[PDB]
Amino acid sequence: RANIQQALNHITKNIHLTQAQMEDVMRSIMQGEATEAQIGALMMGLRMKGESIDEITAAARVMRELAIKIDVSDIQYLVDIVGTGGDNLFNVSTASSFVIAAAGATIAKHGNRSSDLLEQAGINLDLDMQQTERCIREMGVGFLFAMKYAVGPRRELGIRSIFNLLGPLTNPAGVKRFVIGVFSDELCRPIAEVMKQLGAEHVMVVHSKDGLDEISLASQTYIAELKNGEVTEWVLNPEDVNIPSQTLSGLIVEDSNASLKLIKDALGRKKSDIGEKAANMIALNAGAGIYVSGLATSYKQGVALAHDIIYGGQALEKMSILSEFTKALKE
């Protein structure tokens, strides 16, 4: 109790916690030793101070230990595409996952139980870890879904918090290459530095000017990139990779069925006008994944390859093939 109260005191004085201190705190929360009021206070306080690199890294190490894991790190072109949650677009990252797989890379996608969409798409998620790893290894795409004590405070507060940050940072499959979306420009560099410390090889950390935790079709996107042990920052426009920047109109959906309908349009051979808009936003994001997986040697090249897959229809077939596979696994 004293440790948490002490942590809260420092935070009000804008004093960052040490790795040691954050580790103890996150352990307590995970072990159920922190009160709901204390969890709410920690989330709010850390968010307003700004979570430091050490705070986030220490929290991530604690959560990773307490996760059921697999290890598919032997696979070449292994990548995860994952966001904190931003500021109701269709499921771009899930759509991108199939493009990435169809391109010849492998995605082990860490998700938050998207889940409804896959189910709508005839993809059985009632799968254990062993069955998920089979999807990853044999189909080039699997979906990883899962602490307990944070779920209530998170829904009640409704804010973006360190627990959002920790989602991307706790892939349980041994993935080392990532496209990570975050909910502010100032979190891009820090999260890249965290991923470095957790052993990552290549990551793009992104946040668009229009407030998305992904690369936007409508605005510029701020990038922090970890590559070859170093972190750089740069800015992206769709035009930089021969894609026109368009408004997000028609890309906001009401429910899971509308999202799947738009995605199948966007990934199919005969695209509508809004389908072509969706296809282009997917190309920008799937492109980042193809690039950081190592399969393409630049972002531009990755986007090109993505574009080829999206307009050729192969990603839509990868969807269908995964559906048949999962249904086969369940029998």
Q: Does 132 bind ligand BE2 (CB under 6 A)?
A: no
Among the listed ranges 37-45, 81-89, 187-195, 318-326, the one in contact with ligand BE2 (CB under 6 A) is 81-89
What tokens were used for 64? Answer: 């990773």
Q: Does 164 bind ligand BE2 (CB under 6 A)?
A: yes
Output 77 or 178, the one with its CB closest to ligand BE2. 178
What distance in Å separates the CA atoms of residue 299 and residue 23, rounded to the nearest whole number? Answer: 36
213 assigned to a ligand binding site: yes
Per-residue DSSP letters for 275-310? HHHHHHHHHHHHHHHHHHTTSSSSHHHHHHHHHHHH
Helices and strands: H and E segment counts in the chain: 14, 7
110 binds, among its own copies, ligand BE2, none (CB under 5 to 8 A by kind): ligand BE2
Output 85 or 312, the one with its CB closest to ligand BE2. 85
Residue 226's beta-bridge partner residues? Answer: 203, 231
What tokens were used for 220? Answer: 């510029």
* Closest approach of ligand BE2 to the CB of residue 154, in Å: 8
Q: 157 φ, ψ to 5°? A: -70, -45
- Which residues contact its own copies by CB under 8 A? 1, 5, 8-9, 11-12, 14, 35-45, 47-49, 152-153, 156-159
Q: Does 84 bind ligand BE2 (CB under 6 A)?
A: yes
Output 1 or 209, the one with its CB closest to its own copies. 1
Handedness of CA 245, 92, 208, 294 (dihedral sign): negative
Contacts 24+ apart (CB under 8 A), 274-280: 274/250, 277/217, 277/246, 277/250, 277/251, 278/90, 278/95, 278/250, 278/251, 279/310, 279/311, 280/217, 280/238, 280/243, 280/244, 280/246
What distance in Å separates the CA atoms of residue 315 and residue 319, rounded to the nearest whole number? Answer: 6
Residue 208's beta-bridge partner residues? Answer: 221
Task: Answer for the pair 298, 274: CB distance below 8 angstroms, yes or no.
Answer: no
39 binds, among its own copies, ligand BE2, none (CB under 5 to 8 A by kind): its own copies
Among the listed ranges 36-44, 52-60, 104-112, 183-191, the one in contact with ligand BE2 (CB under 6 A) is 104-112
- The residue from 142, 167, 238, 287 that contacts ligand BE2 (CB under 6 A) is 167
What tokens were used for 113? Answer: 């139980």
Q: Does 85 bind ligand BE2 (CB under 6 A)?
A: yes
Among the listed ranges 36-44, 109-117, 189-197, 305-313, the one in contact with ligand BE2 (CB under 6 A) is 109-117
122 assigned to a ligand binding site: no
Helix (H, G, I), strand (E, B) or coil at 124: coil
* Closest approach of its own copies to the CB of residue 145, in Å: 24
* Closest approach of its own copies to the CB of residue 156, in Å: 5
Contacting positions for ligand BE2 (CB under 6 A): 82, 84-85, 110-112, 163-164, 167-168
Binding residues for 5-phospho-alpha-D-ribose 1-diphosphate: 83, 86-87, 91-94, 109-114
Binding residues: 83, 86-87, 91-94, 109-114, 154, 213-214
Binding residues for anthranilate: 83, 112, 154
